[PDB]
Amino acid sequence: AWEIPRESLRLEVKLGQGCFGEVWMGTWNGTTRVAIKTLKPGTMSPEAFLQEAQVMKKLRHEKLVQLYAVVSEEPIYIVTEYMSKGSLLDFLKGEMGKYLRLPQLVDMAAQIASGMAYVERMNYVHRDLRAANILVGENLVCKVADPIKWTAPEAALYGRFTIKSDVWSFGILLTELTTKGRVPYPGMVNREVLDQVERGYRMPCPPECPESLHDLMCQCWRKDPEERPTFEYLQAFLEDYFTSTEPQYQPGENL
Amino acid sequence: AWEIPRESLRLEVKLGQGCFGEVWMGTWNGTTRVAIKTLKPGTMSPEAFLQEAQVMKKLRHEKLVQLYAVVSEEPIYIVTEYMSKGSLLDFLKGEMGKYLRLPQLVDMAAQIASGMAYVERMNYVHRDLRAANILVGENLVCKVADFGLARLIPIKWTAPEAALYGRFTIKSDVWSFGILLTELTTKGRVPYPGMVNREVLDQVERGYRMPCPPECPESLHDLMCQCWRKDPEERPTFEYLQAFLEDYFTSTEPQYQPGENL
Ligand SMILES: COCCn1cc(C#Cc2cc(NC(C)=O)ccc2C)c2c(N)ncnc21
Numbered sequence: 085a086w087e088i089p090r091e092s093l094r095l096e097v098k099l100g101q102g103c104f105g106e107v108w109m110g111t112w113n114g115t116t117r118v119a120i121k122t123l124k125p126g127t128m129s130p131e132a133f134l135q136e137a138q139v140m141k142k143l144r145h146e147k148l149v150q151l152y153a154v155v156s157e158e159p160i161y162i163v164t165e166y167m168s169k170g171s172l173l174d175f176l177k178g179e180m181g182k183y184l185r186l187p188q189l190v191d192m193a194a195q196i197a198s199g200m201a202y203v204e205r206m207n208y209v210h211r212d213l214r215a216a217n218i219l220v221g222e223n224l225v226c227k228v229a230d231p232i233k234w235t236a237p238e239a240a241l242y243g244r245f246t247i248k249s250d251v252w253s254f255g256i257l258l259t260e261l262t263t264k265g266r267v268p269y270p271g272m273v274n275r276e277v278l279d280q281v282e283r284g285y286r287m288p289c290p291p292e293c294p295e296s297l298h299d300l301m302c303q304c305w306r307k308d309p310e311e312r313p314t315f316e317y318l319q320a321f322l323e324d325y326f327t328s329t330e331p332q333y334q335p336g337e338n339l
Numbered sequence: 340a341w342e343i344p345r346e347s348l349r350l351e352v353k354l355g356q357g358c359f360g361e362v363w364m365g366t367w368n369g370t371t372r373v374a375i376k377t378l379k380p381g382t383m384s385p386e387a388f389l390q391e392a393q394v395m396k397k398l399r400h401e402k403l404v405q406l407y408a409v410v411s412e413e414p415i416y417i418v419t420e421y422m423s424k425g426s427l428l429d430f431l432k433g434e435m436g437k438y439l440r441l442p443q444l445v446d447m448a449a450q451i452a453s454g455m456a457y458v459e460r461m462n463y464v465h466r467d468l469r470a471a472n473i474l475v476g477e478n479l480v481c482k483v484a485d486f487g488l489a490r491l492i493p494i495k496w497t498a499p500e501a502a503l504y505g506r507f508t509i510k511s512d513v514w515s516f517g518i519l520l521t522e523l524t525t526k527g528r529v530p531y532p533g534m535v536n537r538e539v540l541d542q543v544e545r546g547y548r549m550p551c552p553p554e555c556p557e558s559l560h561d562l563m564c565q566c567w568r569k570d571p572e573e574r575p576t577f578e579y580l581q582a583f584l585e586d587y588f589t590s591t592e593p594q595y596q597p598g599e600n601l
Pocket residue numbers: 099107108119120121136140149162163164165166167168169170171219228229230
């Protein structure tokens with residue numbers, strides 16, 4: 085029922101490139117602006133593209149990128165909604181990044197937490213939550229889409245991926261938001277990162293970030309995955325943030 | 340207090356020679372290895388030769404060649420830290436260069452951008468940023484050098500507005516950085532190959548810009564082109580350039596794969 089005919093799609097602008105395929109901006113039925121992901125025949129089993137899209141047929145939330153349609157026979161195409169502003173990572177590092185302040189950035193974290201809260205309700209796991217996999221639309225809409233610096237130790241070392249390891253990544257994602265997309269653990273290589281976080285090292289409070297928000301990060305980074313808060317809790321905390329937690333907030337130079 | 344007596348200096352090796360003066364390697368007191376810049380009396384005014392040192396006294400940063408001392412009486416001398424590997428230009432085109440690949444060359448660019456970010460914060464302009472004025476030290480340390488022309492706020496490296504109207508700003512220095520990125524990715528080839536100065540000027544005024552060097556990611560050539568935006572105020576800052584280059588292999592080109600030359 086998701087199937088659509090090939091002549092209904094029009095690929096216009098190439099946005100990205102990979103060994104598994106490409107991503108384009110396009111039109112569906114001449115009217116609907118859309119994102120279109122393609123599969124490169126031979127580079128991957130169709131079964132793998134089909135698994136992703138089967139999952140996207142089961143999940144539906146305003147903060148998860150919506151699948152609109154598919155072309156299941158090779159060459160495959162996956163059609164979704166169009167997030168005009170691209171990746172959160174690019175957004176934060178680029179010309180728009182410089183005007184974002186703490187209230188905008190905490191609202192972006194609340195949207196992402198709301199989408200992850202939904203994933204949590206549905207008993208799914210993301211495994212790769214980070215700024216590069218968050219998509220930004222008009223009016224600062226952020227939606228979840230699709231790496232040891234973002235990966236909880238129990239996952240990286242022992243392969244124990246859970247919603248709690250996603251919560252760890254969310255904490256790291258909070259640092260990207262408050263540094264304008266700077267790589268976490270700056271000047272540390274992966275192996276140094278691994279050894280340090282095992283020994284208890286945790287990133288410090290970013291400059292101009294209230295300590296209350298860095299406290300939340302550290303909750304997300306509790307060694308014991310079951311001590312980490314839920315996305316339901318994180319969503320509520322960030323939604324209420326400027327009344328319940330930092331009611332005396334004052335804007336500064338960067339946050 | 341920057342003044343020192345000559346007897347504390349010991350000039351040993353002639354490293355370079357020029358019309359304004361020379362560059363020598365030496366010893367300061369009896370323990371400190373130093374570089375010593377010389378003036379040939381008459382070839383240039385002492386006040387002008389001293390201007391460089393005047394600027395170097397106010398600037399201090401790990402990615403800028405450090406002034407140690409001066410000899411103001413004729414013949415003047417400028418004493419600075421010694422950079423064991425010489426100029427980035429010579430390095431790039433010489434035998435050590437040929438194994439430099441993109442991760443090393445972007446790290447060099449990141450270091451140079453960190454020093455220029457400092458120049459930017461201090462509201463200085465360099466005016467002569469290019470591979471021949473970056474010095475290489477141990478562990479591939481790169482430091483910005485030669486601030487003769489620098490001051491408080493070569494047309495192949497000079498932004499059009501500076502070359503034409505004398506509008507030298509940190510943004511014209513940013514244009515030069517873009518040119519320097521091409522020197523980094525071609526192993527120090529002269530930019531605009533096969534163009535004389537006048538045609539370079541004519542072309543860049545008409546909107547011509549060097550293309551993406553062989554094996555250079557387009558993302559990095561996009562950065563060069565940002566640096567070369569006609570409107571100097573549309574050129575990025577060194578703060579942005581530094582952050583971008585430091586994070587490059589995770590945030591920008593995470594699928595980088597080594598090739599034959601980059
Ligand atoms: C201004 O640059 C735009 C960059 N950019 C990249 C996008 C993407 C994507 C995508 C993700 C999936 N799969 C899952 C599980 O997420 C499937 C198909 C696609 C096309 C994308 C988009 N979607 N919308 C707007 N901009 C997008």
